Write a protein that binds this ligand. Structure first.
Ligand SMILES: *C/C=C1/C(=C/c2[nH]c(/C=C3[NH+]=C(/C=C4\NC(=O)C(C=C)=C4C)C(C)=C\3CCC(=O)O)c(CCC(=O)O)c2C)NC(=O)[C@H]1C
Length: 301
């Protein structure tokens, strides 16, 4: 069923009667482990600023808004113009350390995300070399756990009725096994599955952290919601954050397994405490997800 309007445009709050209608791609807010700016794709005027931006950028949102990326990021703007796809850079000026910058374009808007910042050969080989699907799933979960340190890494496979089952698991010594457990379709509702066919990694770094609004919440170009499906800092559905908290999960991350353009499954990662998977490790997981997807497709053929 069609998306409801977002809450800030008067849409209903989601219940178990209408899981699938939540417009999860346009929450108008981000997770607090990074900052997000949006900017006009021609002028570089900063249009929207997350309310926490001073934490990462050292200037208040009121000061940042209306400035150009030419003024604020003199080195990256030309490279940004040229490049914009993701553009990625490391910024060295924080006293806090270094910042990872990730940019993507949606229509006429640039979306800029800032957060603090042979294993590959081996992981790729492991995946390519698995001779059957069970071995592939086992090696994928083990490899992701090894790389990330997550407490629990599972492979969740969708059935034709969109229920799912955990079909492989790597987990911390002594943790109760979730392998073999099955869950209803509504736990990963259809609009989420659809989004996950287009934007292949998403996460919640702290399942108890309040979302941070974008200000203004609407894109001034369009007077409409800002597309955040491609922003890993996007705020997570409240329904899902509650699901995670009730499971004792402090941090969650999944990677899509896409076969024939359909969502075959998810690599599902949990940590019991909050945990910000480092930026370079996300990129690695993306690579691994694509490889896993290719191998699942290869094997089913
Ligand atoms: C009425 C709405 C409901 C709801 C919505 C919902 N769920 C997601 C996203 C996910 N659900 C996942 C399901 C599982 N994770 C597990 O660990 C297990 C079992 C042990 C299951 C079945 C997963 C993996 C995701 C993806 C995100 C992630 O990796 O953390 C969304 C979309 C969240 C977002 O991207 O903003 C939504 C709207 N879930 C329900 O249970 C009902 C109440």
């Amino acid at each position: 069923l069609p998306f409801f309007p977002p809450l800030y445009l008067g849409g209903p709050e989601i219940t178990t009667e209408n899981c699938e209608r939540e417009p999860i791609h346009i929450p108008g807010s981000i997770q607090p482990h990074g900052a997000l700016l949006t900017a006009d794709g021609h002028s570089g005027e900063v249009l929207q600023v997350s309310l926490n931006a001073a934490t990462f950028l050292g200037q208040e949102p009121t000061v940042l808004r209306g400035q150009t990326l030419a003024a604020l990021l003199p080195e990256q703007w030309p490279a940004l113009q040229a490049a914009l796809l993701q553009y990625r850079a490391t910024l060295d000026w924080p006293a806090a350390g270094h910042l990872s910058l990730t940019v993507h374009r949606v229509a006429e808007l640039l979306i800029l995300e800032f957060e603090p910042t042979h294993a590959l050969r081996n992981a790729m080989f492991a995946l390519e070399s698995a001779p059957n699907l069970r071995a592939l799933a086992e090696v994928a979960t083990q490899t992701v756990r090894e790389l990330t340190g997550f407490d629990r890494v599972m492979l969740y496979k969708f059935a034709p009725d969109a229920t799912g089952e955990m079909i492989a698991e790597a987990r911390r010594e002594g943790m109760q096994a979730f392998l073999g457990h099955r869950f209803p379709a509504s736990h990963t509702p259809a609009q989420a599955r659809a989004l996950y066919t287009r934007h292949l990694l998403r996460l919640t770094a702290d399942t108890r952290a309040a979302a941070v609004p974008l200000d203004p919440v609407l894109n001034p170009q369009t007077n409409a919601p800002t597309p955040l499906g491609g922003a890993v800092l996007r705020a997570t559905s409240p329904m899902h954050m509650q699901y995670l908290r009730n499971m004792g999960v402090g941090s969650s991350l999944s990677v899509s397994v896409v076969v024939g353009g359909q969502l075959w499954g998810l690599i599902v990662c949990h940590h019991q405490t909050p945990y910000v998977l480092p930026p370079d490790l996300r990129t690695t997981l993306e690579y691994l997800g694509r490889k896993l997807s290719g191998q699942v497709q290869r094997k089913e053929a």
